[PDB]
Write a protein that binds this ligand. Structure first.
Ligand SMILES: [Mg+2]
Ligand SMILES: [Mg+2]
Ligand SMILES: [Mg+2]
Ligand SMILES: [Mg+2]
Ligand SMILES: [Mg+2]
Ligand SMILES: [Mg+2]
Ligand SMILES: [Mg+2]
Ligand SMILES: [Mg+2]
Ligand SMILES: [Mg+2]
Ligand SMILES: [Mg+2]
Ligand SMILES: [Mg+2]
Ligand SMILES: [Mg+2]
Ligand SMILES: [Mg+2]
Ligand SMILES: [Mg+2]
Ligand SMILES: [Mg+2]
Ligand SMILES: [Mg+2]
Ligand SMILES: [Mg+2]
Ligand SMILES: [Mg+2]
Ligand SMILES: [Mg+2]
Ligand SMILES: [Mg+2]
Ligand SMILES: [Mg+2]
Ligand SMILES: [Mg+2]
Ligand SMILES: [Mg+2]
Ligand SMILES: [Mg+2]
Ligand SMILES: [Mg+2]
Ligand SMILES: [Mg+2]
Ligand SMILES: [Mg+2]
Ligand SMILES: [Mg+2]
Ligand SMILES: [Mg+2]
Ligand SMILES: [Mg+2]
Ligand SMILES: [Mg+2]
Ligand SMILES: [Mg+2]
Ligand SMILES: [Mg+2]
Ligand SMILES: [Mg+2]
Ligand SMILES: [Mg+2]
Ligand SMILES: [Mg+2]
Ligand SMILES: [Mg+2]
Ligand SMILES: [Mg+2]
Ligand SMILES: [Mg+2]
Ligand SMILES: [Mg+2]
Ligand SMILES: [Mg+2]
Ligand SMILES: [Mg+2]
Ligand SMILES: [Mg+2]
Ligand SMILES: [Mg+2]
Ligand SMILES: [Mg+2]
Ligand SMILES: [Mg+2]
Ligand SMILES: [Mg+2]
Ligand SMILES: [Mg+2]
Ligand SMILES: [Mg+2]
Ligand SMILES: [Mg+2]
Ligand SMILES: [Mg+2]
Ligand SMILES: [Mg+2]
Ligand SMILES: [Mg+2]
Length: 206
RNA sequence: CCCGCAGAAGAAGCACCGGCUAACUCCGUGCCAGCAGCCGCGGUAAUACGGAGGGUGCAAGCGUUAAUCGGAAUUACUGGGCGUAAAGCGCACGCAGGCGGUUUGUUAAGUCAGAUGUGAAAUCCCCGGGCUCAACCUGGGAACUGCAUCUGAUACUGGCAAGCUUGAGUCUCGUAGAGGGGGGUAGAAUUCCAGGUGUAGCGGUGAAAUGCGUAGAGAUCUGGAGGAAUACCGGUGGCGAAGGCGGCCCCCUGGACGAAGACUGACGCUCAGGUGCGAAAGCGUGGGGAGCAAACAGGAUUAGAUACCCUGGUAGUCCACGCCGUAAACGAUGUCGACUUGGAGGUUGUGCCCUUGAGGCGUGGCUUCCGGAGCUAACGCGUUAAGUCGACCGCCUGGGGAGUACGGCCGCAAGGUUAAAACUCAAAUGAAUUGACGGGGGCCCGCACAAGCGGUGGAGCAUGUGGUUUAAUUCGAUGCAACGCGAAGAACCUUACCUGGUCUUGACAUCCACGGAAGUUUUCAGAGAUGAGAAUGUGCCUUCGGGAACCGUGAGACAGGUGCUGCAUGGCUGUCGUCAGCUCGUGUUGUGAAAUGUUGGGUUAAGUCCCGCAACGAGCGCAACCCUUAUCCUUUGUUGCCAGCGGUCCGGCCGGGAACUCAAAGGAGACUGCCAGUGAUAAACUGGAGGAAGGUGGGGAUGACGUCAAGUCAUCAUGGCCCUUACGACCAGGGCUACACACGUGCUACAAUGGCGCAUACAAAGAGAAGCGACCUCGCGAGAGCAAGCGGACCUCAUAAAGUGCGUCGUAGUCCGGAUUGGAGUCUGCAACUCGACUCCAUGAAGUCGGAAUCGCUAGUAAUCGUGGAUCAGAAUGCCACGGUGAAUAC
RNA sequence: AAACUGGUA
RNA sequence: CGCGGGGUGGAGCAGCCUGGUAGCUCGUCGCGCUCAUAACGCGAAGAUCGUCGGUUCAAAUCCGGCCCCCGCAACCA
C-alpha cells in the first residue's frame, strides 16, 4: 500500500528489531539466510501454537531463539520434551548449538499477528467475512485497545470481482511516530483464490 | 348392483427452477448456437442458451396459442384531472339549453308511504331429499332490485297566484384616466437640394476592405423641400373585455369609480350552435416614401460561410378603403357568487376632528411585494388563492406518426378551421437532490504567468524507444504518469529467443527395488553436451540379512512450465498530490433522494485558530512526536588535535598536557517568548529589542477517503485453463549490439571570461581480504616485477579540479573542436572476430550559438568545477552520493 | 479575431 | 499556311520600358501544436525561362527558327 509500513517506520522509535545479532560483511548474508531458514521451518511446525513473533540473537558463538506464544502448552507439554526436538533440529539447520526459549503472551486477541490469523482461519472455513472481522474489532476493544483497524481484500464471498472492506474504531494515528502500532498481515488460500487480511492495533501514544 | 377365483400382477406424465415467482449445482458453447410475458441473458468460471443430477408446481392430465372481464381509480355515476407532467377557446355579446334570492296560499307533476296486479319456467342463493360420495337430479322458500293502477303525505324541487328588497338595474351631484374616431398645429433630429468658407482625407472594424472625395469630400454656416416618431415628464403609474393605447389643441363619443337620496321589483348567472372585435407578418386598389430594412449586390472572417461583422439596397414599415383571423394572443391560471389570520407600499374618491402642519381617526375602487392556516409531487399559491364551497361552459386520456392525410366550411392567394387511421417504441414527461461541466460570476494558491539565468530543438557521439529487416533480433513498460524504464553491468553464463546436436520418472522434491564409498588421474571419438575404456579408491555406525552421508540403473504415483488470463486475485508500486480536504455518531429539517454540522465574518502554508450560528462531539488528514543541519554546555581524549612549556636531523616528530579544532554520548536553546502599534477588546497581522538561529529557522522521512478494470501472473505467491516421447531438461554457436528512417534523455564542442607550457594553491563523503594494493626497479604508455602496511580516525585507493603567479597563441574552421579511420600496444577473463575497456603514433568530418516549438530554477538556489559508491572477473556520458567557486530577477 | 469533432456495446 | 496571346518543378504561377543569387499558391515527405483528429505553424526535396539558331557577364525582358496549347476563324462526321 501507498502507506509506509508502521512496523518498519518505527523500528528505531518504539519497535525493537526481531533480530539483534552482529556480524561483519563476511558472514552477514549467511546469517540472514540461516535466520530466514530457521524462521520458515519453525513457523510451519508451530502453526497450532499461534506464534506471535520470533526473535533471534547471537550468543557467544551459538544461536538463541525466543518464540512468544499464547499456547505454550503445545510447545512445552510435559517437561521440555517437545522443545528438545525443536532445539536439536534448529541446531542442525543452523549448524551451531541452539537454545530455544518460550515466552507467554496473555490476551492473545490484542496481538496483530494473531488477530489476523484468526480471521484467515475463519475465512478458510467459509465463514462470513463481515462478521469474522466485526468480532475481531469488538473483541479487541473490549480488552482495552485504544484503537483497532481491520481490512480484508480479495474475492470476498467468491464474487467475480475483487473488493476491499475495512472497519476502523477508536483512534489509529498512523502519522504519529510517538505512538506504537502493532501492524500485521496474513493470507488465505480459498478455492476462489487468495484473500489478504491486514490489521492495525493502537495500544498507546508512547 | 351383488357374489366367487387368481394374482402387485394391466395402469404417470407435463411444465418450470435470474427477479416478478415456489424450486441450484456441474459439464458443453463463447454476442456463435440460442432463450425471451416485462426487465433482459450469451463476446471462455452462463443458477437466464444445450445436456445431466437435484428440486418445485400440477396430475390423466400438463403446457402454448386465441378471446372476455379483473387487476386498470388507465373514460373516474359510485370513482380522475387541466400554473409548470395531456388538458382554460385570444377576448367578448348573446339564442336554445342548464341553474336560480326571500313571504304566503294553492296544485300534487317530481319526491316519499301503504295496498293490488304483474315480473313464464329453468338458472343464481338458503334449508332439505335421491343417485354408494361428488358432479348431477329434485321439494319448498327467497330473490325476481323492474313496470302499471289505486289510496295518502306536502318538508324539498316544479307549476299557478299574490307580495318583499339584500341580487340586478335606472335617476341626481362630482372625480381620475396614453379609452376610441375625425381634424389642426408645434419643437428637436436624420436625409436630400441650392449657395458661402475651406482642403486631404472621410467612413467603418476587434484589425480591414468595399464605399465616398482633388470633377473638392468630410467638417462648418445660410436658405429650402419632404417623410416619419413625439426625447424628460415617465412611475413595484393610468385606461381598455382582449388585442392594445404616450407632443399639444379642438369636435363627436364609450366605460369605470365616490356621496348620500329616490325609483323598478328577481328583471339574474352561465352559455353548445351563432355574431362581433382581434399584435406582427401577409394579400388587393390608389397614394406616399425621410430613416430602418427581408430579398439582392459587393467587401471581410473562415478549411468552407448562399451567416454572425461592414458598405449599399427593393418589397415592407406610413395613409384610405377591403381581406386575412393567426402568436410564448401567458398570469402558460374560464366566467359568476359566498366564506376564511396579517404586514409593508402605490394610485384615485370620500366622512369626523383638538380642525394650527406636507397632520389624527375612518370608510370605498384598482394595483405591487412579503407571508400565517390550508393546499400542492415539489416549485410555489396564499382574501386579486393554486384555501373551503356552489352554477354553467371549454378541454385531457402514453411518446412519435400528427394538429398530419381524406372529406366539409371559409379565403384572391398564402393558408385557416373541424379532424383520423395504418405503422413503430417502452418509455416520453414534471419538480427537486448529489456530483460533474460552462468560450457564467466572485475569492485564493502553485517556477502558472510576468521579470531574469541557463538549456532543448542545429552538429558529432552515448543510451532507450518506434519502425524496418533478420535465424532469432526474448519478454515486459506507452500522454501527462513509457522511451539512461524492469536492467545496480547481454563477449560464455546471464538468456527465456534462433539454428543445430541430445534426454523422457527426467535439471530439481518425494515413495520403492537393485547395485555401487564418496572423491581424487589420465586416455579414444566428437564443437561440445556427450557417449565409450583403463585407473586409483572399496571408510566411519554397523544390530553382521544393513543405514546414515552420497553415486549408477529400473517401474509407477510425480516432478516441471519465464505457458495464457493484472478484465479472477494477494502483495507491491505510479498519478491527481504533501493539494487540504474526506467522513462518522447522536440531534434537527425534508414524504424522499438528501441537508445541517463542514456554511458566514476575520485569519493561516493548512477543515490552523477565534467569533457567530441548529447543532453538539469525534475520526482519517494538517501541525507535532522522528532524522539531519546552524549556537552553547557536561563527560571522554586514541589511531585525532597542539594553546601554554621544554629536547628539538627544528616534520606534532618526542617528553608531556588537554586548553582548543575534531570525533560521539548526554543536556541547554527558538516558544509570537518581551515590548510597541493595527485589529470586534479574540484569532491574528506589522515592526522593534534581545538572540547563532524570529515566526511550522533550512532540508529530509512522513502520501488522508478515493479515481485511472493505471502497472506487475516475470520477483514471489495464487483461482481457473493448457503442455507433459514436449510449451519440460542438457550442450556448441548465434541473437538480444542489425539499420534506407523518426522520437526521447544525456555527454562532448563551436573558443580569448579561452587553448597550450612551467610553477603553484585550497575539499568533503566513501570502499578495501580470491580485497585496497605503499615504496623501489623497468617502460614515452596503458602496465609488469618486487611487494611492506591494512578486516581499518593508523595502511591503501588518493598530489580534487576549477582557482591564482608567469610565457605563448591574437580571432582563423585556428595551438578551438574531436568524430571517423590506419598502424602499433597495455590489461580482466577458458575465451576481446561477430561483441569489451584503456594506451602510443598518424589522419583531423560535421560544428563559427542553432526555425516553429519547448524545458528547469527564487539562495548556497541556478550556473559551472572536481571526488566517491553500488551492479561488477573485465565495463559509464547512466543511477546514487560528497564538496569548491557561486549569480540575475520577482513591479 | 478565431476556437470543429469524438464508432458500437 | 489560320485573325492574338501564351509554354518555369507533379499542377497552377511571379521576373512588363526593370536581359543580375529560380520564388509563390496548391500538391509529395518530415517536424511541431492537441488527450486525439481536422484546421494551423515551421521545414526539406523538387528547374536549360516549351524546344533550337544570331546577341551576350545576362535571356520570353534584344532578336530569329522548331514544337505544343489556348481567343475566335476550327471544317463539322
Ligand atoms: Mg426464489
Ligand atoms: Mg461453462
Ligand atoms: Mg374501470
Ligand atoms: Mg388523472
Ligand atoms: Mg385566457
Ligand atoms: Mg356573457
Ligand atoms: Mg328557490
Ligand atoms: Mg306526484
Ligand atoms: Mg344426500
Ligand atoms: Mg331447485
Ligand atoms: Mg324466474
Ligand atoms: Mg313551491
Ligand atoms: Mg346607463
Ligand atoms: Mg363558442
Ligand atoms: Mg401590417
Ligand atoms: Mg399593401
Ligand atoms: Mg402601395
Ligand atoms: Mg445590413
Ligand atoms: Mg392557438
Ligand atoms: Mg401581448
Ligand atoms: Mg406577458
Ligand atoms: Mg393556452
Ligand atoms: Mg407569497
Ligand atoms: Mg390543417
Ligand atoms: Mg382540409
Ligand atoms: Mg518554490
Ligand atoms: Mg517566463
Ligand atoms: Mg541534436
Ligand atoms: Mg506473457
Ligand atoms: Mg521490445
Ligand atoms: Mg504487450
Ligand atoms: Mg546467452
Ligand atoms: Mg490493475
Ligand atoms: Mg425526518
Ligand atoms: Mg466539505
Ligand atoms: Mg455537506
Ligand atoms: Mg470561513
Ligand atoms: Mg482539524
Ligand atoms: Mg616547541
Ligand atoms: Mg527579529
Ligand atoms: Mg507531518
Ligand atoms: Mg511514497
Ligand atoms: Mg488495463
Ligand atoms: Mg499491461
Ligand atoms: Mg549456449
Ligand atoms: Mg536490449
Ligand atoms: Mg586544445
Ligand atoms: Mg569498487
Ligand atoms: Mg571506513
Ligand atoms: Mg591521436
Ligand atoms: Mg571560428
Ligand atoms: Mg567491474
Ligand atoms: Mg464529423
Amino acid at each position: 500500500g501507498q502507506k509506509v509500513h508502521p512496523n518498519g517506520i518505527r523500528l528505531g522509535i518504539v519497535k525493537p528489531w526481531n533480530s539483534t545479532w552482529f556480524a561483519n560483511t563476511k558472514e552477514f548474508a549467511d546469517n540472514l539466510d540461516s535466520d530466514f531458514k530457521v524462521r520458515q521451518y519453525l513457523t510451519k511446525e508451530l502453526a497450532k501454537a499461534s506464534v506471535s513473533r520470533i526473535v533471534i540473537e547471537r550468543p557467544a558463538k551459538s544461536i538463541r531463539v525466543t518464540i512468544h506464544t499464547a499456547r505454550p502448552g503445545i510447545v512445552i507439554g510435559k517437561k521440555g520434551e517437545d522443545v528438545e526436538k525443536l532445539r536439536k533440529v534448529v541446531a542442525d539447520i543452523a549448524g551451531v548449538p541452539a537454545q530455544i526459549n518460550i515466552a507467554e503472551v496473555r490476551k492473545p486477541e490484542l496481538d496483530a499477528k494473531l488477530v489476523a490469523d484468526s480471521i484467515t482461519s475463519q475465512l478458510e472455513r467459509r465463514v462470513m467475512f463481515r462478521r469474522a472481522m466485526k468480532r475481531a474489532v469488538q473483541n479487541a476493544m473490549r480488552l482495552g485497545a485504544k484503537g483497532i483497524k481491520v481490512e480484508v481484500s480479495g474475492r470476498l464471498g467468491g464474487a467475480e470481482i475483487a473488493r476491499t472492506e475495512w472497519y476502523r474504531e477508536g483512534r489509529v494515528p498512523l502519522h504519529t511516530l510517538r505512538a506504537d502500532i502493532d501492524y500485521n498481515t496474513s493470507e488465505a488460500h480459498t478455492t476462489y483464490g487468495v484473500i489478504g487480511v491486514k490489521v492495525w492495533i493502537f495500544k498507546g501514544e508512547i
